[PDB]
């Protein structure tokens, strides 16, 4: 890897600089290099890893949706040749490559070394997320297997989070939020999505009284996203 010669601490320092500069492709390459040093990641470092790749894949997802929309209109009317499909495929392939890279880092060897609930749930949620992003563009004979891989990762993360974390924990909340999005947008299960969002919100509400002002702010921020989705979905 091109980052093999750089110190771990320097990679982390430069990841933070790249974030400030909104250079998320650089940020992701720096954090990939940091992961490949082989040491476990701290809470802050896990968040840097997620911020970097979420922004990279976020740009690819937005582009893919634009191109896919154009492609579907073309098939309603004038023929224009293969270019729209070709370029949609180009972006799609790049997106799939980023997802495969993240999933590879989780499998080699972030997840197997993660023993604390906060790290293990964070990484398993990430695994579900990037299989979900793959599912968003999947159309062939492995769409079903991609969907079940996302579901399986989310479910393992959910089981741990319910046993080991309070209902207001932001990682637990963000996991439940994203699993509910998986149900609604990927798995054709809107009722499951709604039920999960409502129970997650209500169980967090009842635990807010235990929190400091700062933790209350962290938790209510994610709870509002659950509420926004319920308003969209009902």
């Amino acid at each position: 890897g091109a980052m093999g010669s750089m110190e771990r601490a320097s990679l982390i320092q430069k990841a933070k600089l790249a974030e400030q500069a909104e250079r998320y492709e650089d940020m992701a390459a720096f954090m990939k290099g940091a992961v490949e040093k082989g040491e476990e990641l701290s809470c802050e470092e896990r968040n840097l890893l997620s911020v970097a790749y979420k922004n990279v894949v976020g740009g690819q997802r937005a582009a893919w949706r634009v191109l896919s929309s154009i492609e579907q209109k073309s098939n309603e009317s004038e023929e224009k040749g293969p270019e729209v499909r070709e370029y949609r495929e180009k972006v799609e392939t790049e997106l799939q490559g980023v997802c495969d890279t993240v999933l590879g880092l989780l499998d080699s060897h972030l997840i197997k070394e993660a023993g604390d609930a906060e790290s293990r749930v964070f990484y398993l949620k990430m695994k579900g997320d990037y299989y979900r992003y793959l599912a968003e563009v999947a159309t062939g004979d492995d769409k079903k297997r991609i969907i079940d891989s996302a579901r399986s990762a989310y479910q393992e993360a959910m089981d741990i989070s319910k046993k080991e974390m309070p209902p207001t924990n932001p990682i637990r909340l963000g996991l439940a939020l994203n699993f509910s999005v998986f149900h609604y947008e990927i798995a054709n299960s809107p009722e499951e999505a709604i039920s999960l969002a409502k129970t997650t919100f209500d169980e967090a509400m009842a635990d807010l009284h235990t929190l400091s002002e700062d933790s209350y702010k962290d938790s209510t921020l994610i709870m509002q996203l659950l509420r926004d989705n319920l308003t969209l979905w009902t």
Binding site: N47, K54, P170, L177, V181, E185, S215, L225, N229
Partner: peptide
């Protein structure tokens, strides 16, 4: 589309 989680979680 639905809202998903921010990347950074405490």
């Amino acid at each position: 589309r639905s809202h998903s989680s921010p990347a950074s979680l405490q």
